[PDB]
Amino acid sequence: REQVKDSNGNPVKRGAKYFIQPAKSNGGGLVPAAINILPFCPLGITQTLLPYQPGLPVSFGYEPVIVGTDYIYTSTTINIEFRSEIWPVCNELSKLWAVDVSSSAAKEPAIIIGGERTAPNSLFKIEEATGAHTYKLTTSSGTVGTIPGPWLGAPQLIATNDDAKTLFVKFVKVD
Amino acid sequence: REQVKDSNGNPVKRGAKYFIQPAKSNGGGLVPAAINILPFCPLGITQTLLPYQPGLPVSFGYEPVIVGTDYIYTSTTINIEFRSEIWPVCNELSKLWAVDVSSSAAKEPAIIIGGERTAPNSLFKIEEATGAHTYKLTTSSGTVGTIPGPWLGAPQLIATNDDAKTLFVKFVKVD
Amino acid sequence: REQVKDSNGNPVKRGAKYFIQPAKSNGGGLVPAAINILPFCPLGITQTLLPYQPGLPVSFGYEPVIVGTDYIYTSTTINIEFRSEIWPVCNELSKLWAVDVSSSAAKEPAIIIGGERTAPNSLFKIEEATGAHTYKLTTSSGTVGTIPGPWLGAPQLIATNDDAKTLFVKFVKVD
Amino acid sequence: REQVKDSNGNPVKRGAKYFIQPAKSNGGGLVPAAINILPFCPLGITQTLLPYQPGLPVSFGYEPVIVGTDYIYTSTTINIEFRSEIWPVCNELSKLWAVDVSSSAAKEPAIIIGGERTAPNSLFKIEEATGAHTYKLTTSSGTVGTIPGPWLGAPQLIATNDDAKTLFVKFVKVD
Ligand code: CHL
Ligand code: CHL
Ligand code: CHL
Ligand code: CHL
């Protein structure tokens, strides 16, 4: 277990805002986007294709609670939540990431938004990967990966046992 | 081979307008609807869920050409085209039904709109089923069936080898 | 005051389902449609451009209550509500028609959906017009008219003091 | 006439990429967004409400041509064009800004996207305003201003003679 480092080499602090940015990519950061038409709640998570769009900010917090430290460590369960004043749709749902565990869940399930803090489908871990300050995300439903999704095939986040799909990311401190 | 009959028992005439109406259903007729977000062309085909919506009209014509008869027969290749003055999207494409044979085609492929008159993926046959004036549609990619689609799970037309999915229809003469 | 007659000459019954159909038109009936993008609630009301689309059904009821008669009369306050099992958006709002009296209300205000039974902006009257079984609708904000709206300029219902905009309708009994 | 300066005090260079960023605001930069539902082409221009969204990049070029200088000066006609590899809709139209001069043009007309290089409705000027490196944009249809538009009332660009609506901007060099 080590301190997760942001793209500047500084440790990632609990509750602080980060953009999650796919590594070795021409696209921007991770953002909410609908994966279904109607209903469109809950939203999925997508890499925007547009180069200078940094993503929607997230913050990390330990779950279950770990008291005493300000830093996020690898291989330890956290919640990931989008941080936005403006949120016009899907308001009956939270902004925590979670694996889709509904009855319509794909064999390789969507990462959606609206998980319950304590539910098991809401628990992620950050794990080191090769490259500087490059990481992967894992859940109890598999590694976080992408498939071409409904927005011009923009990467769409799923949980997957296929290593080829793994999403490698950096955390860019919101400045 | 027999004359296909409309819901009033009258033979179906080439080039005349019919609604295609799922049998034993509380929903309305078959209509264009997007199956993808962006791009949304080509459109797919859906049963509307709304009870009094009769569908968008279609017409049937023989392909290859059969000269001499005014009536549509079973077990004979036809094109099916939507008939609408108003058509605001997907205008570079035709209004003929076709099986999706693109590279992103699902294992059970979508019925889409925009087929070429002569292409093989544009050829349907009407086949008798049980019930009065009830029929099924077949293509060289399988029988026409539905799966719950993106519009509140409204039936979405596919080509399928699964008999459980078969869409049974009547043709209601546009009056 | 006279009994309002449907398109077959039969009196209009309280609580029964009617389509509202613009007279002397090539379009279909009146339907819910968004007049704003985001938020899209509350919905407005539009004439569909498509020829065989009959509209979404409505029912008429007296407000304030008139007890003893089964029939709708002219020049008497009623509510108009859309009647639909399926209603996927704007669910915190009712299906009663009402004049928009919000703070963003246009000088010629939109007819919207989601009025309170007793509120004054929810009160319509049916008034005779020329032509057989042709009527107009009025509210305390003006006569019901249309302007070209956001759906390919499809007639969009407003309340207006301009006689040129008046919407003439028939009521087609849902069969 | 002076050299227009970016947000770092450096002169603005012809053909280089800038974000246009409203001054004294909590929102992000200027972006394409639909102002009509259907058709949605041509697109309008909006300030995104989201704080860290920098805008879609633009570049400035003299029109009519001014040969010999690399810098953009005030009070001189230019074109403004969005610069994006990805452009999925409205492709029959250009990416140059222009005042809407169609027959449905509002009394205070929309700034749209898709102007012809030489047409007069495509000609902007940058003019100094108070504040450091703060500017306004003007056209022969009036000063560039905003009204609350259809995206949660996000500022929507118009041409206006009302000084209260003026949009004050800085140009942030795309890095
Ligand atoms: C209704 C829910 C909802 C939908 C549909 C979307 C959709 C999208 N978001 Mg998300 N979001 C949604 C909720 C929210 N988002 C965000 C915050 C963000 C941010 C910060 C960003 C996104 C972005 C995106 C886009 C990422 C895909 C891309 O690369 O395309 C790019 C493709 C285009 C730019 C072309 C135009 C897309 C256009 C905006 C929508 C086009 C609509 C279609 C024509 C509709 C078609 C209908 C079909 C069914 C017929 C995608 C358009 C990213 C983006 O790229 O935005 C520009 C982005 O940076 N979202 C928040 C917090 C405020 C939400 C709250 O609910
Ligand atoms: C952009 C392309 C396009 C899209 C998205 C649709 C979509 C639809 N068509 Mg089709 N059509 C489209 C092209 C065309 N249609 C038609 C002709 C028809 C007819 C005659 C009918 C349809 C109907 C339908 C609907 C059938 C599903 C249902 O049962 O839901 C019913 C669900 C509702 C009524 C709820 C509201 C739906 C609303 C109109 C759209 C909601 C938009 C979402 C909020 C957007 C969400 C964005 C996401 C990505 C975040 C569906 C909404 C049927 C229908 O039901 O219409 C009412 C119908 O009867 N279409 C023509 C010829 C003119 C087209 C030409 O291009
Ligand atoms: C999200 C809310 C909502 C929206 C956007 C609409 C929109 C519409 N309704 Mg309504 N409805 C909505 C709620 C509901 N409707 C209905 C019941 C009906 C009925 C019965 C009918 C309508 C129809 C219509 C259409 C009338 C205009 C027309 O003539 O165009 C016709 C234009 C087309 C057919 C072209 C394709 C339209 C397509 C379905 C939507 C296209 C989406 C755009 C690409 C999105 C663009 C995004 C922009 C911002 C970039 C319009 C598309 C009528 C219709 O024509 O449907 C086909 C119709 O008959 N509605 C119910 C009860 C179930 C609703 C419940 O919430
Ligand atoms: C279809 C055409 C089209 C539409 C509808 C839009 C729409 C939008 N663009 Mg634009 N764009 C479009 C074309 C393009 N855009 C861009 C590049 C960008 C950038 C870089 C950005 C935008 C952003 C925006 C948004 C600015 C408003 C805001 O503050 O809301 C914010 C509101 C939300 C985030 C909530 C969710 C919005 C969601 C993406 C769409 C929701 C759809 C509705 C549910 C549909 C409702 C249907 C109605 C009719 C019933 C708005 C959603 C900005 C943005 O904020 O994106 C996130 C932004 O940063 N656009 C390009 C170049 C690639 C385009 C090319 O065609």
Author numbering:
A (entry chain A), B (entry chain A), C (entry chain A), D (entry chain A): 1 to 175
What do the authors of the reporting publication say about this deposited model?
The 2 amino acids-longer motif (-PVCNEL-) found in Bo-wt at the corresponding position does not lead to a preference for either Chl a or Chl b. The increased length of the PVCNEL motif forces the potential H-bond partner (backbone nitrogen of V89) away from the C-71 carbonyl, resulting in a distance between the backbone nitrogen of V89 and the formyl oxygen of pyrrole ring B of 4.0 Å. In Bo-wt, the increased distance of the first suitable H-bond donor in the backbone of the PVCNEL motif seems to be compensated by an alternative H-bond donor at a suitable distance from the formyl group. Its assignment to a water molecule is based on the small available space inside the binding pocket and to the faintness of its electron density in the crystallographic structure. Therefore, the position of the water molecule inside the Chl binding pocket appears to be not rigidly defined, both in the crystal and in solution. Bo-wt also has a proline residue in the binding pocket, close to ring B, but the residue conformation is not affected by the binding of Chl b and a water molecule, as it retains its endo-conformation. Additionally, the Raman characterization proved to be fundamental also in the case also of Bo-wt, as it allowed to reveal the presence of an H-bond partner for the bound Chl b, not discernible in the crystallographic structure due to the flexibility of the binding site. Accordingly, when the surrounding of ring B is less hindered, like in Bo-wt, there is little or no selectivity.
